């Protein structure tokens, strides 16, 4: 049965069979196969049942009940006897058991099964592979080998009937005090180690906090840590303890809030930039044209496109030169998150320059348009906007080479022309 009383080894067996235990962890040797001088007892096959051995209600081992069927083999010619060894190897340990069995002369039928004998039991750790051998002494036939596998702590039998499966550093979260709290309902005497890391995708290592502790404990989170990939790792301070990994911020709102709050754009070369962020979220990027008025930065799509940018990886510009009025806009989930103008300290601040977009029509003509806040206006135009009133002077500026080229194509080009001469 599943639970057995105190660790007294036990052997029972079939009706009418005599069975005595000799187990002193005995020395077991199968030796060579000798011929049978008449009828011998011989084991037919092996079988195993999983049991539990509790010495106190607290300490319970996984115990393996072994059984062996017996038949009468050998030569044919008043009751029979034998002694059978059950060897139990389960790296690193091993234990052997010797059983004495008598079978009466009335159950002696040459060529049938005469009964079976059952031993409880072999203790073994969780999830350990167990070789079990069985043989008569002396050995008249081949040995009996069985290779089994015990269940993990996961598995209804184990974790329900075993109390030893519950040393979990139980974790709870409490974001109610305007901050976030981590509660560790463990035992008072629990020594354990705790790690807070930023779970990057490719190249995961990003440690953030490490501590040896003796809980239970409640840890408070800083506003700089709440990012999506912020994950927790816990384990008791024991040799080869098992570590628990959880990411409860995978979809916290303030997590993404602080994540994009902490993201930064930083220039490398004139034609290479970099994005810094605690976590790695999907995002697209594109260059933007910012007027000196302030925020109304019109993205340059077309002739550009939103290219994917990955955190901690370089994206390269397609520009010929940089300009103080060239920002970079970074969106994620099709929502503008970051807007940083990377040339504002190297070449800035924003100059009073108008952006022009020329399109090479058929026959390699050239038609020009000026990107104003109210969309683009073709030149020359009859409007009262600042660009249309002075469009002729702007064309004179371009065809004299006074404008700065920023992008060249086969059927398109971009320019910027200063306006300080008219103001």
């Amino acid at each position: 049965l599943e639970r057995l009383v105190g660790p007294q080894d036990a052997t029972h067996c079939s009706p009418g069979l005599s069975c005595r235990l000799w187990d002193s962890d005995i020395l077991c040797l199968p030796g060579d196969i000798v011929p049978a001088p008449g009828p011998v007892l011989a084991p037919t096959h092996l079988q195993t049942e999983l049991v539990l051995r509790c010495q106190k209600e607290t300490d319970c081992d996984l115990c393996l009940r072994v059984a062996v069927h017996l038949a009468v083999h050998g030569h044919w010619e008043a009751s029979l006897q034998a002694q059978v060894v059950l060897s139990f190897q389960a790296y690193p340990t091993a234990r052997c058991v010797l059983l004495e069995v008598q079978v009466p002369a009335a159950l002696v039928q040459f060529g049938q099964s005469v009964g079976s004998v059952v031993y409880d039991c072999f203790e073994a750790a969780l999830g350990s592979e167990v070789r079990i051998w069985s043989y008569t002494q002396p050995r008249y036939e081949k040995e009996l080998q069985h290779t089994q596998q015990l269940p993990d702590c996961r598995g209804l039998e184990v974790w329900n009937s075993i109390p030893s499966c519950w040393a979990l550093p139980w974790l709870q979260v409490s974001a109610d005090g305007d901050n976030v709290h981590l509660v560790l309902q463990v035992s008072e005497e629990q020594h354990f180690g705790l790690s807070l890391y930023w779970n990057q995708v490719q190249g995961p290592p990003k440690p953030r906090w490490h501590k040896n502790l003796t809980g239970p404990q409640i840890i408070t989170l800083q506003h700089t840590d709440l990012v999506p990939c912020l994950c927790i790792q816990v384990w008791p301070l024991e040799p080869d303890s098992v570590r628990t990994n959880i990411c409860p911020f995978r979809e916290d709102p303030r997590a993404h809030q602080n994540l994009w709050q902490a993201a930064r754009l930083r220039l490398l070369t004139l034609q290479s930039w970099l994005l810094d962020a605690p976590c790695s979220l999907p995002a697209e990027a594109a260059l933007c044209w910012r007027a000196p008025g302030g925020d109304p930065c019109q993205p340059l799509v077309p002739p550009l496109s939103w290219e994917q940018v990955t955190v901690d990886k370089v994206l390269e510009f397609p520009l010929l030169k940089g300009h103080p009025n060239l920002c970079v806009q970074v969106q994620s989930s099709e929502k503008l998150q970051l807007q940083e103008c990377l040339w504002a300290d190297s070449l800035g601040p924003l100059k009073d320059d108008v952006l022009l977009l020329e399109t090479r029509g058929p026959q390699d003509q050239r038609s020009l348009c000026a990107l104003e806040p109210s969309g683009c206006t073709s030149l020359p135009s009859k409007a009262s906007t600042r660009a249309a009133r002075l469009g002729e002077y702007l064309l004179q500026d371009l065809q004299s080479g006074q404008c700065l080229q920023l992008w060249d194509d086969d059927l398109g080009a971009l320019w910027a022309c200063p306006m300080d001469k008219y103001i």
């Binding site: 002193s24 005995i26 040797l29 030796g31 060897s87 190897q89 340990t93 969780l126 350990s128 080869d240």
Partner: protein, 109 residues
């Protein structure tokens, strides 16, 4: 010769706790089961380092480190037969139990 009792004193300890050490190790090893019916234990497990170097975080071999076996002398019992006068004799066997990752010796001039 003297009397050797058949029962084996058992420590009763069950300190055994790790699992799949041989595969989780940075110096992984394979096992070879040697079998002898006139030897106790009949099954003697011999380890063998799988590689010369150690396995890095990416699962590739690192030849800057060496996997080295840990060997220990142990005793087994040999069963001997000289007709009716069965006797036993102790025998020393060298067992490789596992491997560890060590820094190679750097002799220099």
């Amino acid at each position: 010769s003297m009397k050797l009792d058949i029962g084996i004193i058992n420590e009763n300890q069950r300190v055994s706790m790790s699992r799949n050490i041989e595969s989780r190790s940075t110096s992984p090893w394979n096992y070879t089961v040697t079998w002898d019916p006139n030897r106790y234990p009949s099954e003697v497990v011999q380890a063998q380092c799988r590689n010369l170097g150690c396995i890095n975080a990416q699962g590739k071999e690192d030849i800057s480190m060496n996997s080295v076996p840990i060997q220990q002398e142990t005793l087994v019992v040999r069963r001997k037969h000289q007709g009716c006068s069965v006797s036993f004799q102790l025998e020393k066997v060298l067992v490789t139990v596992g491997c560890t990752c060590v820094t190679p010796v750097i002799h220099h001039v």
